[model samples]
Target: LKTAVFNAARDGKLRLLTKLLASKSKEEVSSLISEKTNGATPLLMAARYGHLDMVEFLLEQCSASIEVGGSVNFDGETIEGAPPLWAASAAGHLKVVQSLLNHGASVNNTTLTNSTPLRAACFDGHLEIVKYLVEHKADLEVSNRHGHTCLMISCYKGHKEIAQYLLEKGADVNRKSVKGNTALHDCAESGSLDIMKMLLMYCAKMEKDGYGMTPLLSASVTGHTNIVDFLTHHAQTSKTERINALELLGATFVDKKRDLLGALKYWKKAMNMRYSDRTNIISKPVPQTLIMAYDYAKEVNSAEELEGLIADPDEMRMQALLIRERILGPSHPDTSYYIRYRGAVYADSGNFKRCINLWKYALDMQQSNLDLSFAELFWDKNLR
Candidate 1:
């Protein structure tokens, strides 16, 4: 019966709704009015599907009111029923929206996640609805659960005209999401060059995200070549940041473009460049070439290619070895194990003397860390 009532309203079955309401008592009417299944009320269904007559009948004749809100779930997003007005606005049912606003639906009412009618309208690309909501003084800065403003969603969705209108109407052009992605980042991710230009024109920050990625890095990883080019030339990216972005771009090309040798060249390029700005630069050192070398070692069945990758394999491995030991403890077995593996790579690459010395040192270090009689078993020549 609850589903029947909701379905009747959704499909605009005025006769059936009228009959159901006539047969029910006052308590049933109240419950039916406020009832929600799958997070939608009768009023919400009516407005969502553009059934203006059914909405009006429920509001006036059937003594239904919009005191408690209704909601609906769609597209991995929870559409909170702050009022049927939001649903009406999102659907672009102009007459239905007008009726809800006439009934004094609070334009400021938001979802628990803080999505407003204006945000919904922005996402749906309904320019008239957005203009209407703004005229009614809707909160322009209210963010959804993900901390996305109306302008941000519009930018993310590539709604150029709507984004422009919002910007012209004083929307915050530089708002960021919970991921610390600005509208420019959205443009980079979604490959909206026009929107990206618009954001740049408005002075959107091209700074790094929470994971230390700039818009250039985001564009490069996503294969937005034109955007990558534009941001690389125009945006205020640092030298180190450009190198890091190129390193990520190399991996992206390896995965997307299927160009392994070219990708290795990019890695080499990033590794070869030396930046001089030492102050205020907190370097997050990820062993970019070493990662690819290990991958190449797996595919080619030999570690010899690593010698051609970085200029000084000895210096490179030494830095990595010390860094890993500092992060993980010196006594850690894995630390010594990595050193042993590094020695094997050196041996395969023709650095035989270094390989033998490194292998002996790693073994001695691990063996000394062991204290009990089990250590004696490991040292036994017969066991070897």
Candidate 2:
């Protein structure tokens, strides 16, 4: 039976597997041997489960083809569409992996997710498996579905040993992900100061991404103040870099990271470095950041000069609403709450009709779905 051979190979029941194969007629045996379910073949399972003897028997004695790639499923999740070698490597079965490679399995074969054996090994921190795969010339530059290379994954996971080994073997330290994140960026995100220093020694470009963000900027954005301090005060730190380092954290709270109000004291210090009037926001890289870039423009520019500098606040608010709607569904409670807040802003600007309409629409949507009563509360203009 299909189940017999599959289970026999998986459980390493070699005698039963051999007998079962022998009992089948030649025509039946070929078809039976090839039978698989859920994208898994007997050899794939044998290799995955580390049944070396069963894998050898299937390949050598039974004429089982090594090219029959498949995947094994657990629960509703599946590791899909990979060859036997990939399954073995992903499972970190070093002996099975070596045996498959010796049997002429392609070392660079990728799964449906474009996952190579080397990447799988690095991701799981299987040091010896990674060594073996890399030694066999596994494609070092291959990225998975997320455009993450082995080096990127290792650095992101804080696997210093794996990252070091990959770099030692001449991996590109400045190699970027799909979004242009380098390993140094990963180091900043992970708060790995030692790893950041090591990567810097390798000249992992203290450069910016497509968004003009460096590792130092990444550290600042993520609230890794210690890493920020280390990066800013390091011997290689430039005066220009240090001056602009804390520019992203003006008096506004970003998600869970730095509290802008609390860091105002530090913001005050950066102000001392400025020699010129920051009069024109048009010259600034990002007015959406640094407390909407409004704080400094108001401080330095005259009212006539202010019109040009304050040109983007309305545009900024529109972009914020678009961002919130895209990230959180249109009907999300927080999205609705932001609509309410924006409505209040309109009221402050004397656009009362638009403000009241936005609230009325929100109430209409709420009434149909929510049992909660806001009818009384809607008329309560004094109610917050």
How high is each candidate's TM-score?
A: 0.67, 0.66
Ten consecutive residues with minimal summed lDDT in candidate 2?
Answer: 292-301
Task: Judge candidate 1 at residue 13 and give its lDDT.
Answer: 98
Full-model lDDT for every candidate: 0.67, 0.65
Cα lDDT of model 1 by residue, 118-206, tens digit: 88788768888888889888889988777778887787677899888888888887777776777777788778899888877788877
Query: What TM-score does model 1 achieve against the real structure?
Result: 0.67
| RMSD per model, one decimal | 12.9, 11.0
lDDT for each residue of candidate 2 in 256-315, tens digit (9 for 90 to 100) = 332434344334434444433456222223333332211222232123332342344553
Off by over 4 Å in 1: 1-3, 22-31, 37-39, 62-64, 76-82, 257-384
Whole-model lDDT, model 1: 0.67
Give the winner by TM-score.
1
lDDT of 1 at 104: 77
